[PDB]
Design a binder for this molecule. Structure first.
Ligand SMILES: Nc1ncnc2c1ncn2C1O[C@H](COP(=O)(O)OP(=O)(O)NP(=O)(O)O)[C@@H](O)[C@H]1O
Ligand SMILES: [Mg+2]
Ligand SMILES: [Mg+2]
Ligand SMILES: [Zn+2]
Length: 292
């Protein structure tokens, strides 16, 4: 079996952490609320057993993730607060996001109001703008990788498929993993860079407004044939300006898409109502956005 330790100690930083409430399993890691015994502050604790990292390549992938993720501090990126290990386990200490991800929100709400979509998309774009000037492609932007804190602020997490562009006009040929909103240039194996993230944000924009993902079928390889052919449609009730931004992002030619630093200056953002913040009720109930 090999049980997880009830207390978790960091030998370099001399910080102790009590294993609180269980949050959920993703792949290898069991995640937990964890408390500094002295500071009482709460974190998310990613906990992977080393019995699942028996392979050097699985260790290298985990090293790259930490190296990339720890190099990052931004308002709309999950804060990296440190990592450590004993003989049996690896430990990652992260910014806690108490209201889970946009996937859970979408499962409960489906199509959001337009101002809600603007609101979440502005923050995702901001977070992803910081990644891109820091030469990081995330490569798996999706609802489940987009976390919400107590104030409904977005935090991009999970740099497991992330890579760093080391030189100019470098085209990545390797992606060990399967992104959810995978770009057509990844699928056709042509080479890829930053535009991959904009593609995925366009899929996110569609899903948040329409209430279902743009290329979904019963078969994953059929989905991939739709992505290759650019085979999707926007329901007529979606406003023309929103529809138009989606179209710009969901182009096959990566050079034809807009840059991450172009996005926030689109008419969709500059000329629509963006709330400063959302009440907690928005997890469950469509906001009306009254003046009362
Ligand atoms: N700060 C956090 N607060 C709460 N849960 C978190 C936090 N960071 C990570 N998690 C999670 O632990 C899991 C680990 O991620 P994992 O499932 O391996 O990859 P993923 O692509 O992020 N998410 P999924 O979309 O669920 O496959 C997530 O699904 C969340 O449940
Ligand atoms: Mg998971
Ligand atoms: Mg990961
Ligand atoms: Zn591999």
């Amino acid at each position: 079996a090999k049980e997880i330790p009830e207390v978790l100690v960091d030998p370099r930083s001399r910080r102790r952490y009590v294993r609180g409430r269980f949050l959920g399993k993703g792949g290898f890691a069991k995640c937990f609320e964890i408390s500094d015994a002295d500071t009482k502050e709460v974190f998310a604790g990613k906990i992977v057993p080393k019995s699942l990292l028996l392979k050097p390549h699985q260790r290298e992938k985990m090293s790259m993730e930490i190296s990339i993720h720890r190099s990052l501090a931004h308002q709309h990126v999950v804060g990296f607060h440190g990592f450590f290990e004993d003989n049996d386990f690896v430990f990652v200490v992260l910014e806690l996001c108490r209201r889970r991800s946009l996937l859970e929100l979408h499962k409960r709400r489906k199509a959001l109001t337009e101002p809600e979509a603007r609101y979440y998309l502005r923050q995702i774009v901001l977070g992803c703008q910081y990644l891109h000037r820091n030469r990081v492609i995330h490569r798996d932007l999706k609802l489940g990788n987009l976390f919400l804190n107590e104030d409904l602020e977005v935090k991009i997490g999970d740099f497991g498929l992330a890579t760093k562009v080391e030189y100019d006009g470098e085209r990545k040929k390797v992606l060990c993993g399967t992104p959810n909103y995978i770009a057509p240039e990844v699928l056709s194996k042509k080479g890829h860079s930053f535009e991959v993230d904009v593609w995925s944000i366009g899929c996110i924009m569609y899903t948040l407004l329409v209430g279902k993902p743009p290329f979904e079928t019963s078969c994953l390889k059929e989905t991939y044939l739709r992505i290759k052919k650019n085979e999707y449609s926007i329901p007529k009730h979606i406003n023309p300006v929103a529809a138009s931004l989606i179209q710009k992002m969901l182009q096959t030619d990566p050079t034809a898409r807009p840059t991450i630093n172009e996005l926030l200056n689109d008419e969709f953002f500059t000329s629509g109502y963006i709330p400063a913040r959302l009440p907690i009720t928005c997890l469950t109930i469509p906001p009306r956005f009254s003046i009362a």
